[PDB]
Amino acid sequence: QQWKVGDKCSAIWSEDGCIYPATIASIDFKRETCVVVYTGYGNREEQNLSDLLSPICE
Ligand SMILES: Cn1c2c(c(=N)c3c1CCC3)CCC2
């Protein structure tokens, strides 16, 4: 997938290694990272772009 800022996705939370819904807050194209915000949980963390999942994965 080609992701954009604001996209809904699912990501693997670094704390528990499980998949959750999130929104892309920003993308660093040089570093190939992004920051996601976990829906309903308020927190954010960086992900590798390559690691994001379809927003249907939950
Ligand atoms: C399940 N969970 C998740 C996140 C949390 N901050 C917290 C929980 C549990 C409490 C904090 C991020 C994505 C999933």
Numbering used by the authors: 90 to 147
Question: What do the authors say?
Answer:
Here we report a potent and selective antagonist with a 4-iminopyridine scaffold targeting the Tudor domain of SMN. In order to understand the structural basis of compound 1 recognition by these reader proteins, we determined the crystal structures of compound 1 in complex with SMN, TDRD3 and UHRF1, respectively. In this study, we identified some low micromolar antagonists with a 4-iminopyridine scaffold targeting the Tudor domain of SMN, and compound 1 shows >4-fold selectivity over other tested methyllysine or methylarginine binding domains.
W102 and Y130 sandwich compound 1 rings. In addition, compound 1 forms a hydrogen bond between its imino group and the side chain of N132. On the other hand, the mutations of the SMN cage residues Y109 and Y127 weakened, but did not abrogate the binding of SMN to compound 1. Hence, the sandwich stacking interactions of compound 1 by W102 and Y130 of SMN play a more critical role in the specific compound 1 recognition by SMN. Due to the electronic similarity between the N-methyl and 4-imino sites on the 4-iminopyridine core, we did not expect to resolve the orientation of compound 1 based on electron density alone, and could not exclude the possibility that the imino group would instead protrude into the solvent. Although the binding affinity of SMN and compound 1 is not high, SMN binds to compound 1 60–180-fold more tightly than its physiological ligands such as symmetric dimethylarginine or R1810me2s-POLR2A (Kd of 2.6 μM for compound 1 vs 476 μM for symmetric dimethylarginine or 175 μM for R1810me2s-POLR2A9).
